[PDB]
Design a protein around this ligand. Sequence first.
Ligand SMILES: Cc1cn([C@H]2C[C@H](O)[C@@H](COP(=O)(O)NP(=O)(O)OP(=O)(O)O)O2)c(=O)[nH]c1=O
Ligand SMILES: [Mg+2]
Ligand code: NA
Ligand code: NA
Length: 327
Amino acid sequence: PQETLNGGITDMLTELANFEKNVSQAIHKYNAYRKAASVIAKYPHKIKSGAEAKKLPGVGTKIAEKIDEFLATGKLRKLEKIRQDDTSSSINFLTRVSGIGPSAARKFVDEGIKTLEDLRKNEDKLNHHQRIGLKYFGDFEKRIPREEMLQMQDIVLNEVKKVDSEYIATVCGSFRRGAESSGDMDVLLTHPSFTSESQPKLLHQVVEQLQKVHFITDTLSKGETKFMGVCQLPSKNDEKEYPHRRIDIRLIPKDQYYCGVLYFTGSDIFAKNMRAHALEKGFTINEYTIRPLGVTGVAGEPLPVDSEKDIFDYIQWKYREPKDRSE
DNA sequence: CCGACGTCGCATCAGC
DNA sequence: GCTGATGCGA
DNA sequence: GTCGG
Ligand SMILES: Cc1cn([C@H]2C[C@H](O)[C@@H](COP(=O)(O)NP(=O)(O)OP(=O)(O)O)O2)c(=O)[nH]c1=O
Ligand SMILES: [Mg+2]
Ligand code: NA
Ligand code: NA
């Protein structure tokens, strides 16, 4: 209901989560802290003790103790300590560069590379993805206003149709959900000559065209069905430049399109809650298909899908439009 | 006591 | 050269 | 770290 009811606590758990993933390299702890952060931020009361919070599904003893220390002292001792730790905080920060995960960050800090400057002084030791992530460190953390998302959509749909009028391109993500701003642009791509049953360079032709009109500027990774890169809007004649933005383009078989749209429309936390319920109801869902689970709990053949609501029907959930799919 | 905790595509690395 | 494992991001 | 077999 409101971030400031227990925001001091949720910040704490979120901070603790990051250090688990990035420094301890313990992903399941990281999730446990965020799972607890989620359920507490939805708690419509100001928490007065660890024991009270422990009633919430996801909060156990160890987190309850920490809330007590926080409520009493207004801080965490393990957190004040790890914040000032040069090794730990450097590793944690370095992972904010796209391409640098917990492993690489630990490897960089170990040979003394602790900052963005140290990184820029050492371009040789970075791979392609990491260099680009370093180059656009600031831009990749900026949000994209909906107005710009719309202009970027204009260029995408236009140039996609120019390569082949039978391409189907849909911008998904938070944009499709109607958010006033997005973190990146998610593009789903579809062509009549590409299905599960079965032209060579369908994804490439779209990418290179977007490169030619000088929209796509860099490539993080590119395979046959999935592209990851950087793009930028053209600025007014003498006006200043737009930030470089992240854009993913994904070629999905046309007969699996709606499972793709649903999956990449999100939201991430919604898309998770859905498939979790689906599994509890006898189905399994991924980016391509929805398959019924057997009596020994094994998946069968992919069911037919001709709309997003079909997948909703299968798992006994009433339809939610993209704008209502945040959680 | 201790195992589960989501999954996909691509770059890169370990190893034959 | 090749297959398979691991790191990574969404 | 938490839940649950
Ligand atoms: C972050 C994330 C995303 N995904 C998938 C499912 C999401 O529905 C889909 C969208 O990803 P996104 O771009 O991180 N989510 P968004 O576009 O809704 O929010 P934003 O404005 O781009 O940050 O990517 C995962 O499967 N695991 C993840 O950890
Ligand atoms: Mg997105
Ligand atoms: Na509990
Ligand atoms: Na990163």
